[PDB]
From a paper:
Seven cell shape-determining genes (csd1, csd2, csd3/hdpA, ccmA, csd4, csd5 and csd6) have been identified in H. pylori. Among them, Csd3 (also known as HdpA) is a bifunctional enzyme. Its d,d-endopeptidase activity cleaves the d-Ala4-mDAP3 peptide bond between cross-linked muramyl tetrapeptides and pentapeptides.
Numbering used by the authors: 41 to 250, 257 to 332, 337 to 409
Write the structure that this text describes.
């Protein structure tokens, strides 16, 4: 297949451009239409054409693990939402600061995405802002690959920065949030419910085997006020097929989506800075509901996990398992730092983490 980069088309625009009957979109359920609205610009997608240059297949990612599959069978086109098959690689970055955290990470990885994730993860960290030459930064992270090619964003499993001989750790969890070594949340966001809803008509779902919905649908009256769940900056504001009128707001590594609006607030525009609690529009059905979506580092995440008044902590068996892994991870990081000298090199980018050792 040809590997290409998505630019500005909608699904419908893509169908039109390639002479695929547009009913393939119009016939979708409203849930599938919402799903189809999340094709991001710059995603890598795949196409296959026949001798006539007719589009006979396409694979278009809508998340890190779901994609649209369009294919011609006999005389007709079909559209499925299917899993993405991928390979995951783990690396360990070990770094002695030479210039700035950001520049050094780029030097060692050539990856702005990872560098931005670290800055964001430590955004409120006082020791982080006070890092100086020869302070240490370690990151254990994974990246996902499709036929050899990385896609989406990396995932930080563990990070550590040292300042004045003290080490400041954070760890990911399968729930998508970061935790310190006492299993309490760090680098969180306190989001507020953005509308007065009558009920949640459809919660967030990965749709995973034991259905995918990448937001929360809040049933509300047409015209109900919609308030920003957070501070941030408006990125997009307008109409997207499947979402109707929508506002997107960015804050650190979050993108927050508010869809199906009947109207935007007067004077709101692309680039507007907004405050948590500020009115950004009104509920519509462009019956009525607000679709509220949250994306961390490009990946959809359950918004409800961040609507809380306090910082989260892990509990029960989740806490036990976490702390066990955290201890093992900390011990292993020390061993790796002992066995890779910053006299020889300012950084090391190592294959794997727990299994990494020499002979
Ligand atoms: Ni090594
Ligand atoms: Ni061995
Ligand atoms: Zn929805």
């Amino acid at each position: 297949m040809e590997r290409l980069v998505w630019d500005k088309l909608t699904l419908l625009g893509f169908l039109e451009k390639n002479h695929i009957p547009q009913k393939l979109y119009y016939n979708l359920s409203s849930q599938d239409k919402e799903l189809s609205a999340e094709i991001q610009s710059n995603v890598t997608y795949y196409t296959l054409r026949d001798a006539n240059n007719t589009l006979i297949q396409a694979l278009i990612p809508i998340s890190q693990d779901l994609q649209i599959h369009i294919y011609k069978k006999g005389e007709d086109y079909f559209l499925d939402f299917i899993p993405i098959i991928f390979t995951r690689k783990e690396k360990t970055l070990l770094l002695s600061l030479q210039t700035s955290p950001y520049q050094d990470i780029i030097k060692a990885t050539n990856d702005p995405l990872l560098a931005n994730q670290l800055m964001n993860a430590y955004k409120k960290s006082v020791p982080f802002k006070r890092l100086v030459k020869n302070d240490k930064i370690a990151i254990v992270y994974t990246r996902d690959y499709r036929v050899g090619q990385a896609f989406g964003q990396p995932t930080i499993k563990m990070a550590m920065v040292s300042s004045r001989s003290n080490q400041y750790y954070l760890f990911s969890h399968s729930n998508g949030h970061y935790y310190d070594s006492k299993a309490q949340e760090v680098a969180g966001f306190l989001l507020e419910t953005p509308v007065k809803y009558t009920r949640i008509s459809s919660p967030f779902s990965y749709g995973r085997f034991h259905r995918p919905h990448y937001g929360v649908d809040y049933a509300a009256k047409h015209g109900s006020l919609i308030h920003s769940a957070s501070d941030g900056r408006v990125g997009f504001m307008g109409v997207k097929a499947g979402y109707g009128k929508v506002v997107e707001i960015h804050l650190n590594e979050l993108r927050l989506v508010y869809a199906h609006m009947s109207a935007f607030a007067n004077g709101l525009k692309k680039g507007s800075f907004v405050k948590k609690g500020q009115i950004i529009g009104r509920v519509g059905s462009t019956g009525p509901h607000l679709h509220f979506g949250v994306y961390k580092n490009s990946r959809p995440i359950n918004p409800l996990g961040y609507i809380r008044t306090a910082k989260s902590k892990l509990h029960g068996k989740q806490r036990e398992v976490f702390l066990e892994k955290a201890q093992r991870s900390k011990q292993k990081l020390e061993e790796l730092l002992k066995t890779h000298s910053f006299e020889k090199n300012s950084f090391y980018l190592l294959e794997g983490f727990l299994e990494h050792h020499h002979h």
